[PDB]
Design a protein around this ligand. Structure first.
Ligand SMILES: Cc1cc2nc3c(=O)[nH]c(=O)nc-3n(C[C@H](O)[C@H](O)[C@H](O)COP(=O)(O)OP(=O)(O)OC[C@H]3O[C@@H](n4cnc5c(N)ncnc54)[C@H](O)[C@@H]3O)c2cc1C
Ligand SMILES: Cc1cc2nc3c(=O)[nH]c(=O)nc-3n(C[C@H](O)[C@H](O)[C@H](O)COP(=O)(O)OP(=O)(O)OC[C@H]3O[C@@H](n4cnc5c(N)ncnc54)[C@H](O)[C@@H]3O)c2cc1C
Ligand SMILES: O=c1oc2ccccc2cc1O
Ligand SMILES: O=c1oc2ccccc2cc1O
Lengths: 340, 340
């Protein structure tokens, strides 16, 4: 009963934890190994601010909306425990600003105190005439990854630093079930023409007087290509870069200047904030998450593959409803094989 | 035309600035001196978190409500300037939690996005069943005092470190108008049986993941004797001590334990927050602010006194409507004396 999880981002770690907590007793010799090229300080998950916010549109897969809601409910129930800070979990309120009166989100009742912005609030942001105010949650990738790692270490999950070349290489080592949580790099193991990098560039700035997130929206320039300010525990994340199909894992001045100019206009107090760091990340963009079973009859033995990737810019927002669904798929592998 | 302001807290400094900005041209040789025992890092103003919040009750003096509103409007208009951080000025949202359904405040429309808490929000705080959520402003005393000082230094206002024994001592030095902004210590210069210390004890804790203020209310134990959490730029203020008539300028373990136990129950994540400092302050409590003219015919020459003290736990919330009213009273001294 050997299980290999490929990837140590929020997807891989949360899935490994979910499978363990649901099947560690059910199956007595349950072996779980985590195979990843990049761990905990250097994944895409570490680059994310961690704000819980799904896309404004209804998902292509109606299950995704339920997956997001399940994660918010799981996270909100732990927000007040004396542990919540080890997870990098905290409540935060803020603004979603629009150029016109768009419909309310599907998640309007999932979040706390959702409402329409008043004219006195809209007066504070001179280029926007519509908006929302609500209270959401930030789950910082860096801390959450460290937390999931500790939980996995105490549960006997063994971690391995390696770049996997094919699923066959893994199957040959004697892994019955393979959990593929490769993120943006999932194409390298099995070509997927629906998966593409959603290049983002962000600035981490010291502005501790910023207590609210501010996300702006423009249908013209599209999703995440508009300014955003997301306060974290130690720093403030400045962003607004979204370049589909760009694999440049390097910061660039044009993107820097665009984030700076755009964020300073939104919040002019930022002109005196110190820049601590700047980073680049690839959102694993797909029309919908690939979370399904596949048979590797093309390779060694029977050997089933659980795909779990393509979380775009909403990986942290959705991860828990995903890990649970993957844990449900893992159970179906046990019952179908006549292994009750 | 010599003017002496006694006090370098928010009251004295904001009044000195207001008189200067309104009468520096009107009167060509306008001499302004600031006399204070304790300056900028050590006043009661430095101990205040700086949240804009008047009392839940309608003021005894209906002008006080207009004075608070004038300060919020003045501060909100400067919240977004690239300077706002030199002032220690920032927007903040949060909770006011009650044991029962009390009426809406007088200031419900002064604040941003004021609303009643929903049942899902009230579920987060197990001992409270009613509440409000709104967006207010924090004006940090420490930074604001440094700002007013710089503004006064560039305007030629001369500062003097001394303990004034009587108004007569000041009148004898040749001061025509005396502005008395002595705060809680105003009784020492002229007995005032309405003015009393509102002893408060606070903890400054490192909890940067706290993005909202939380103020609790109990009619049983009274005003500010209930837990409160107020995040600042660099630290989180923990409080809930209000002892009328207690002059103990010393922290005590009973008050410490009361703030700790009460705040940790409100927000259990605080159990792992580091204590950076603890302080004691005396709110200058009076049934209403004394902001009026008095003739010192009892002392040297004619010599008018402008009283400006007794701002309780709402000094920063009200200071600007006060400084403006004092500046208006100073003008009445010029026109009555047949000095047009
Ligand atoms: C700038 C930016 C901001 C974002 N902000 C938010 C946000 O506020 N909220 C939110 O909900 N989401 C956000 N996201 C999205 C979030 O970061 C992702 O959806 C989530 O981190 C992706 O998780 P993952 O586990 O799919 O990928 P990753 O974090 O990339 O991890 C994939 C893992 O698989 C590994 N791997 C890949 N190929 C192999 C191989 N052959 N062998 C071994 N290992 C392999 C990598 O080494 C890595 O460990 C943001 C993204 C970016 C870039
Ligand atoms: C624990 C606590 C928390 C608070 N939180 C808030 C809040 O969140 N929001 C809010 O709006 N308000 C708050 N307050 C209230 C606020 O601190 C006061 O109302 C305001 O600071 C008082 O201002 P002042 O200028 O009257 O007094 P002070 O800051 O005390 O200054 C009085 C000045 O007069 C001087 N002085 C006195 N006597 C003499 C003399 N004989 N000669 C020379 N100088 C003299 C002192 O040296 C000092 O410089 C809080 C108070 C406390 C104690
Ligand atoms: O760049 C991003 O910013 C966000 C802000 C809030 C919620 C999700 C995201 C995803 C992004 O890619
Ligand atoms: O202790 C105090 O806490 C406050 C919180 C908000 C607004 C005013 C006050 C005044 C206090 O004295």
């Amino acid at each position: 009963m050997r299980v290999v999880v490929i990837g140590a981002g929020v997807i891989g770690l949360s899935t490994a934890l979910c499978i363990h907590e649901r099947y560690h007793s059910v199956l007595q010799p349950l072996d779980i190994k985590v195979y990843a090229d990049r761990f905990t300080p250097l994944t895409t998950t570490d680059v994310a601010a961690g704000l819980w916010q799904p896309y404004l549109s209804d998902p292509n897969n109606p299950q995704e909306a339920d997956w997001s809601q399940q994660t918010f409910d799981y996270l909100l129930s732990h927000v007040h425990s004396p542990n919540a800070e080890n997870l990098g979990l905290f409540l935060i309120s803020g603004y979603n600003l629009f150029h016109e009166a768009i419909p309310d989100p599907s998640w309007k009742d999932t979040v706390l105190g959702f409402r329409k912005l008043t004219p006195r609030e809209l007066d504070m942001f001179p280029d926007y005439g519509y908006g929302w105010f609500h209270t959401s949650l930030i789950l910082e990738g860096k801390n959450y990854l460290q937390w999931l790692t500790e939980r996995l270490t105490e549960r006997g999950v063994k971690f391995f630093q390696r770049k996997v070349e094919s699923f066959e290489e893994v199957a040959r080592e004697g892994a019955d079930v393979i959990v593929n949580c490769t993120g943006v790099w999932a194409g390298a193991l099995q070509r997927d023409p629906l998966l593409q990098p959603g290049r983002g560039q962000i600035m981490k700035v010291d502005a501790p007087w910023m207590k609210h997130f501010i996300l702006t929206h423009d249908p013209e320039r599209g999703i995440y290509n508009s300014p955003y300010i997301i306060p974290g525990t130690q720093t403030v994340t400045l962003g607004g870069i979204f370049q589909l199909g760009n694999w440049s894992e390097l910061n660039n001045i044009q993107d820097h200047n665009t984030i700076w100019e755009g964020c300073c206009r939104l919040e002019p107090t930022l002109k005196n904030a110190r820049i601590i760091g700047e980073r680049t990340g690839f959102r694993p963009v797909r029309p919908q998450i690939r979370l399904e079973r596949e048979q590797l009859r093309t390779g060694p033995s029977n050997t089933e593959v659980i795909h779990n990737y393509g979380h775009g810019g909403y990986g942290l927002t959705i991860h828990w409803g995903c890990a649970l669904e993957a844990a449900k798929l893992f159970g179906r592998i046990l019952e179908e094989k006549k292994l009750s």
